[PDB]
Design an enzyme around this catalytic site. Structure first.
Site, PDB file in Angstrom:
ATOM      1  N   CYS C  10      17.149   6.946  37.893  1.00 46.48           N
ATOM      2  CA  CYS C  10      18.156   6.730  38.925  1.00 46.48           C
ATOM      3  C   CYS C  10      18.534   8.036  39.610  1.00 46.48           C
ATOM      4  O   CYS C  10      18.598   8.107  40.842  1.00 46.48           O
ATOM      5  CB  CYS C  10      19.390   6.066  38.312  1.00 46.48           C
ATOM      6  SG  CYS C  10      20.073   6.966  36.906  1.00 46.48           S
ATOM      7  N   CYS C 108      42.300  45.337  49.123  1.00 37.31           N
ATOM      8  CA  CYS C 108      43.363  46.137  48.530  1.00 37.31           C
ATOM      9  C   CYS C 108      44.670  45.891  49.273  1.00 37.31           C
ATOM     10  O   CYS C 108      44.723  45.983  50.501  1.00 37.31           O
ATOM     11  CB  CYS C 108      42.998  47.620  48.574  1.00 37.31           C
ATOM     12  SG  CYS C 108      44.325  48.727  48.050  1.00 37.31           S
ATOM     13  N   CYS C 111      46.112  49.649  51.263  1.00 42.34           N
ATOM     14  CA  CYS C 111      45.446  50.115  52.472  1.00 42.34           C
ATOM     15  C   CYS C 111      44.872  48.981  53.310  1.00 42.34           C
ATOM     16  O   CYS C 111      44.570  49.196  54.489  1.00 42.34           O
ATOM     17  CB  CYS C 111      44.323  51.094  52.117  1.00 42.34           C
ATOM     18  SG  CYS C 111      42.907  50.326  51.301  1.00 42.34           S
ATOM     19  N   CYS C 155      41.150  51.387  44.096  1.00 37.34           N
ATOM     20  CA  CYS C 155      40.705  51.516  45.476  1.00 37.34           C
ATOM     21  C   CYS C 155      40.285  52.955  45.737  1.00 37.34           C
ATOM     22  O   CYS C 155      41.051  53.888  45.472  1.00 37.34           O
ATOM     23  CB  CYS C 155      41.809  51.100  46.450  1.00 37.34           C
ATOM     24  SG  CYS C 155      41.289  51.077  48.178  1.00 37.34           S
ATOM     25  N   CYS C 158      42.503  54.727  48.438  1.00 40.85           N
ATOM     26  CA  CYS C 158      43.807  55.116  47.921  1.00 40.85           C
ATOM     27  C   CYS C 158      43.721  56.071  46.738  1.00 40.85           C
ATOM     28  O   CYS C 158      44.732  56.694  46.396  1.00 40.85           O
ATOM     29  CB  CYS C 158      44.606  53.872  47.511  1.00 40.85           C
ATOM     30  SG  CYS C 158      44.949  52.722  48.863  1.00 40.85           S
ATOM     31  N   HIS C 239      24.760   5.637  35.815  1.00 39.92           N
ATOM     32  CA  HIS C 239      23.741   5.197  36.757  1.00 39.92           C
ATOM     33  C   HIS C 239      24.113   5.695  38.145  1.00 39.92           C
ATOM     34  O   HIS C 239      25.277   5.614  38.545  1.00 39.92           O
ATOM     35  CB  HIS C 239      23.605   3.670  36.749  1.00 39.92           C
ATOM     36  CG  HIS C 239      22.760   3.130  37.861  1.00 39.92           C
ATOM     37  ND1 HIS C 239      21.430   3.459  38.013  1.00 39.92           N
ATOM     38  CD2 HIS C 239      23.058   2.285  38.876  1.00 39.92           C
ATOM     39  CE1 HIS C 239      20.944   2.840  39.073  1.00 39.92           C
ATOM     40  NE2 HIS C 239      21.911   2.120  39.615  1.00 39.92           N
TER      41      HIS C 239
HETATM   42 ZN   LIG Z   1      43.518  50.832  49.041  1.00 39.61          ZN
END
Ligand SMILES: [Zn+2]
Lengths: 512, 401, 292
Positions: C10, C108, C111, C155, C158, C239
């Site tokens: 099926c 982030c 920033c 980051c 940063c 099924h």
């Molecule tokens: Zn940042």
């Protein structure tokens, strides 16, 4: 609950900002500007143009980004909020730290002020908002060190902005939860929720009555709210990217907006089509501060991610998508020190090769905590290859550049796994034994401590102005002091309870 | 999950009143089979005894009729005033005639899933006139039925074939399929009339677009008729002039419910895109959209008792929606949204239209909601399980005399 | 016509019929190869394609019930790589019809710098909740996870640990969108996982809300072509059936049997709502085709 020892490799003063500037305060009675630096140092400047060296003093006690500052009590008292999860009370006139509040559990991101009752509010990423009476904070002593805590419940997400009205009757919190939330600071009762923004809110302003509200958001929109109708009045879209800073005149008619797109406009709230581009800064705008010495604002101080702080006069502002700016050169310029952005540990695990924002490569020494020599604007990758040493030494410290200065961190997990012979390291009979770089460093950091008495190790001495920091992993700052200040009476009493056991072993017991 | 029993707004705390709940006497939850939706109708008998409010609802095969007491304790569920059991086709919609309604006689017509309509007088149980009993006019299921505003005999029905039929109580239906003659052809709609010397019951056949006509709603004044179909077009017509007034295409899917504002200046529309859509009548343009539902919207309604029209106060509206997500949403229309300063022009892009957020968004039932009625003292909701819940407005829960 | 259900076939028949009625897919099949032979036979025993699947993949060698999504995803990429390998003498027509692209954005919060990480997909696996719609399930698929507190994101701009938001959003819309409703979810115990019989409504027209604004034709209109329904109250104890639209009329394929059905009768395949864990005849894989 794991204590870590940290220290910073820097000069004794560092009288210029070593990183960007998060907040600005202005005392018109003394003509002084306060800069909250991303280098954990608050600096007092002089806006009086008759002087040529604007630097006055440095207020340094924080160990992480200073995110916001508030000046109270006619310039006498200063309140600071920082990423080290602390809110510190300062003496803004003399320039020293008075008390430290450790109620927040995360980055303290913003402060709010209410002059008519001398009330300050602190909020940040721990989703909490605390209310502080300034007069009770300045009276904190060693005997009466506790204070009543009054916190507001409400926010479901991190807080990035906070604003109170002058009367002390409306307090608004902006948040990565896009909704603005309002309280009554006296009863702590929730007043309303202001829906509308679709992103984080980093700028908030309130009129003196506490009836309207200006909000700058990362969605790129400025919204004027009606607290009476509990809804949005107008929605201004003068920026391309996220609005981060806002300032308003005394009449609450014109709004000064800045943010990520480096643009700074002066938009009329009543008629938005009259926008005047003041200037296009070099870096994204983080915070702005108007000069409030005339019926119209004569100038406005701007803080960016760069270390320099500029001032822009608005002389021809009433006579003027605006592609042509009003100003191109600033009126005043406060200079900024460069920030160490890239760091590379060498194979000997003692010397570090850095590179700052001026593309100046420098050669540092971690053990002695000194700068060997500046190498100018040479290639950074090729200098790493040219300074290669054929030797293996295990990792015994970590370095972070969040403050822009070199911050070295020592952890019990791998501090002492640094056995190096003395002759090839650079020391002298000439017995040449195996020395532990990590344990030898802890004895020089606590060299002036009378409990660790030979005076030092012998082989080397760290600078006396090197700030030693004891703290917790991703945690709160536990105690901070200079290397020479270890001999103070009350400062040595703290070293008996603050210093962990594994540091006492190497410095006192000579366990090695 | 647990359903909510209260919610706060600027007006106050709305509170659910379980002692004012209406359902089957056995109170066992009606199995939420595909079946047909449970609907609710109200009517006032000139409040000659103060208990002038009558309630009618259908639950599968049964159709009850009680005395509605609002925020007071509900009437004895074991002793209805009238009860009808339909072994054949099941009821799907109904409406009272608010004009010809008194303590001695109340006119109530009921639609069925076979296409039939049946006039019923529940307080006397005497008359019973069936319409389209032979399924010769239309065989598809009826969706919405309502009397003509101000009329005493005419009423309009709408079926899943995308057609509408105007009837008359006095007339009788044909014994054969009625022959139609064209009256007005229009943009994606057609109106015909019965070509017969004798007064046949199908007064006119109103073909409205493709797909099933899910609901229609007359304007509060009566002059206009707003229709929503499965193809996703909101078509508002002039009832007297019989011509197109305005159209609106959904963002996608197809529009399930529709209603008018109290002053008749705006229309909100729920559909298969989990969105409510506010539409201006005078300007014929979309002014707002609302995203607060997890599934399709079932019923939309304006709240006349928390709406401030005109003024020096600002204009503000209040309307609610309930959806198949078992949730109730309340929305505010204010002047910043009203007065701001596959075709997309009559279906604006998401960036060209404001996006509203609900005041509240509470789960209030275990099954999909199918009823949302705003009353003076309370809000009335109902789910597919056949529970007619009553939400007391702030301050309307208790009276003092 | 109809296909022969030899037994537990099926889930191969259901997708096969559903795959056919994709007019762009059935067109370019004219030129693995066993499927192109069975497609020409209709335009019926699939023994040539069934036995070839058992020897090709060892996972399907057993004679038990299995997942139609696992075979649909395997059937598409297997035809894709043989088309790319035979083209050595890059965008194949199998990818031009089914391959969409979604990006995993990291933002982030300080920033507000966004970094991307694209992912190509043929099927769109979406989670399921009770009393919802597919357009809300797609909103749940594109929710915004927040890195904060002890799990801050470092980051580089940063030079510090800040809060960040991870988020998935479709970058390029496919010609045919395949929506896999994850109805088989882990039982959280040692017992075999259960079948989520939630009522998930799906409309015939469709537009996506969780699109990145960088694209141009992000809000294109879609139309429901086929939907693979799955009966049974268990993950491997049911099924498969297929509703599908050849022309204006809708057809129903239960294994070999074929029967015409009205469009309003699809309401019975949304899902249970009383949560009685019964047959739960519910849609499992949805096929949407672009208008233009
Ligand atoms: Zn940042």
């Amino acid at each position: 609950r794991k204590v870590q020892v940290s220290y910073v490799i820097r000069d004794e003063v560092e009288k210029y900002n070593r990183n960007g500037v998060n907040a600005l305060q202005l005392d018109p009675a003394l003509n002084r500007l306060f800069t909250a630096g991303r280098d954990s140092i608050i600096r007092i400047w002089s806006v009086n143009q008759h002087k040529q060296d604007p630097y006055i003093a440095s207020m340094e006690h924080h160990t992480d980004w200073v995110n916001d500052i508030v000046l109270c009590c006619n310039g006498k008292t200063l309140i600071s909020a920082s990423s080290d999860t602390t809110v510190k009370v300062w003496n803004a006139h003399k320039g020293f730290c008075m008390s430290t509040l450790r109620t927040h559990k995360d980055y303290v991101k913003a402060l709010a002020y209410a002059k008519d009752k001398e009330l300050v509010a602190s909020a940040g990423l721990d989703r909490q908002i605390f209310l502080w009476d300034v007069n009770t904070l300045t009276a904190l002593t060693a005997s009466n060190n506790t204070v009543t805590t009054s916190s507001l419940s409400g926010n479901k997400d991190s807080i990035y902005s906070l604003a109170m009205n002058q009367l002390g009757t409306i307090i608004v919190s902006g948040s990565t939860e896009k909704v603005l939330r309002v309280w009554d600071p006296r009863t702590c009762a929730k007043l309303m929720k202001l829906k509308g923004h679709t992103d984080n809110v980093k700028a908030l302003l309130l009129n003196r009555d506490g009836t309207q509200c200006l909000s700058g958001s990362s969605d790129g929109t400025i919204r004027l709210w009606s607290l009476g109708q509990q809804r949005c009045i107008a929605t201004y879209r003068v920026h391309d990217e996220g609005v981060w800073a806002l300032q308003v005149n005394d009449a609450f008619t014109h709004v000064y907006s800045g943010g990520r797109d480096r643009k700074i406009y002066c938009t009329d709230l009543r008629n938005p089509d009259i926008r005047v581009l003041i200037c296009e800064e070099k870096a994204p705008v983080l915070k702005m501060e108007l000069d409030r010495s005339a019926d119209p604002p004569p100038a406005i101080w701007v803080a960016t991610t760069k270390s320099t702080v500029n001032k822009w006069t608005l002389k021809g502002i009433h006579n003027f998508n605006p592609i042509t700016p009003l100003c191109t050169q600033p009126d005043q310029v406060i200079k900024g020190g460069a920030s160490i952005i890239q760091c590379h540990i060498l194979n000997d695990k003692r010397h570090i090769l850095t590179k700052d924002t001026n593309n100046n490569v420098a050669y540092w020494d971690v053990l002695k905590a000194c700068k060997v020599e500046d190498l100018g604007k040479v290639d950074f990758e090729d200098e790493i290859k040219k300074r290669f040493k054929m030797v293996y030494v295990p990792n015994w410290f970590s370095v972070d550049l969040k403050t822009g200065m070199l911050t070295i961190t020592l952890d019990e997990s791998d501090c002492f796994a640094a056995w190096v012979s003395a002759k090839d390291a650079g020391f002298s009979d000439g017995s040449d034994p195996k020395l532990n770089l990590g344990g030898l460093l802890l004895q020089a950091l606590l060299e002036y401590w009378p409990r660790t008495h030979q005076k030092g190790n012998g082989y080397f001495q760290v600078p006396p102005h090197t700030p030693v920091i004891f703290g917790e992993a991703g945690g709160r700052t536990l105690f901070r002091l200079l290397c020479r200040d270890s001999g103070g009476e009350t400062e040595s009493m703290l070293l008996n309870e603050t210093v962990p056991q594994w540091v006492i072993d190497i410095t006192v017991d000579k366990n090695m | 999950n647990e359903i909510k029993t209260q919610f706060t707004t600027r007006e106050g705390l709305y509170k659910l009143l379980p002692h004012s709940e209406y359902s089957r006497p056995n109170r066992v939850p009606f199995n939420s089979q595909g079946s047909n939706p449970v609907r609710v109708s109200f009517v006032n008998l000139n409040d000659q005894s103060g208990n002038g409010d009558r309630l009618c609802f259908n639950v599968g095969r049964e159709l009850y009729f009680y005395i509605y007491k609002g925020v007071r304790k509900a009437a004895d569920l074991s002793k209805p005033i009238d009860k009808r059991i339909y072994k054949g086709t099941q009821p799907t919609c109904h409406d009272f005639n608010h004009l010809t309604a008194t303590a001695e006689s109340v006119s109530l017509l009921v639609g069925f899933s076979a296409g039939q309509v049946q006039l019923i007088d529940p307080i006397k149980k005497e008359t019973s006139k069936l319409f389209n009993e032979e399924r010769l006019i239309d065989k598809s299921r009826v969706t919405c039925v309502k009397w003509v505003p101000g009329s005493e005999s005419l009423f309009l029905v709408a079926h899943s074939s995308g057609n509408m039929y105007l009837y008359n109580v006095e007339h009788t239906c044909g014994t054969t399929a009625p022959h139609y003659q064209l009256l007005k052809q229009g943009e994606s709609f057609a109106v015909h009339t019965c070509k017969s010397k004798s007064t046949r019951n199908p007064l006119l056949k109103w073909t409205v677009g493709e797909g099933a006509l899910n609901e229609f709603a007359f304007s509060p004044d009566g002059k206009f008729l707003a229709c929503v179909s499965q193809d996703g077009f909101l078509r508002v017509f002039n009832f007297d002039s019989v011509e197109l007034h305005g159209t609106m295409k959904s963002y996608f899917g197809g529009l399930l419910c529709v209603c008018w504002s109290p002053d008749g200046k705006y229309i909100v529309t729920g559909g298969e895109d989990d969105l409510v859509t506010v539409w201006s009548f005078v300007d014929c343009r979309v002014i707002a959209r609302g995203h607060g539902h997890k599934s399709w919207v079932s019923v939309v309604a304006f709240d006349p008792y928390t709406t401030s029209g005109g003024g020096s106060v600002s204009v503000t509206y209040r309307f609610g929606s309930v959806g198949q997500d078992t949730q109730l949403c309340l929305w505010d229309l204010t002047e910043d949204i009203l007065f701001p300063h596959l075709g997309t022009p009559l279906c604006p892009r998401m960036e060209d239209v404001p996006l509203l957020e609900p005041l509240i968004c509470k789960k209030i039932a275990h099954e999909r909601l199918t009823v949302l009625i705003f009353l003076e003292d309370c809000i009335v909701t109902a789910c597919q399980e056949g529970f007619i819940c009553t939400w007391g407005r702030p301050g309307k829960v208790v009276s003092f005399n | 016509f109809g296909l022969v259900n030899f037994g537990n076939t099926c889930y191969c028949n259901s997708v096969l019929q559903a795959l056919y009625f994709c007019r762009p897919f059935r067109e370019n099949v004219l030129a693995l190869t066993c499927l192109a032979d069975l497609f020409h036979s209709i335009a019926i025993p699939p023994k040539k394609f069934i036995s070839r699947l058992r020897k090709e993949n060892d996972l399907f060698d057993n004679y038990m019930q299995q997942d139609a999504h696992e075979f649909l995803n395997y059937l598409l990429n297997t035809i894709a790589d043989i088309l790319q390998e035979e083209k050595k003498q890059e965008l194949t027509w199998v990818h031009e019809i089914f391959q969409g692209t979604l990006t995993n954005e990291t933002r982030c919060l300080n920033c507000e710098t966004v970094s991307s990480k694209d992912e190509d997909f043929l099927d769109l696996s979406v989670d399921v909740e009770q009393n919802t719609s597919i357009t809300h399930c797609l909103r749940d698929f594109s929710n915004t996870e927040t890195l904060c507190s002890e799990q801050k994101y470092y980051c580089e701009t940063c030079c510090s640990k800040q809060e960040a938001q991870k988020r998935m959003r479709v970058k390029k819309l496919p010609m045919i969108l395949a929506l896999h409703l994850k109805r088989f979810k882990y039982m959280e115990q040692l017992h075999r996982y259960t079948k989520l019989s939630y009522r998930v409504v799906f409309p015939l027209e469709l537009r996506l809300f969780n699109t990145s604004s960088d694209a141009v034709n992000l809000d294109r209109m879609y139309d429901l072509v086929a939907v693979v329904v799955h009966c049974g109250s268990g993950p491997n104890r049911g099924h498969y059936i297929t509703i599908v639209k050849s022309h204006g009329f809708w057809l129903l394929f239960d294994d070999d049997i074929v029967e015409k059905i009205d469009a309003q009768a699809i309401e019975e395949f949304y899902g249970l709502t009383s949560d009685i864990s019964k047959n739960s005849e519910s849609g499992y894989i949805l096929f949407y085709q672009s208008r233009e």
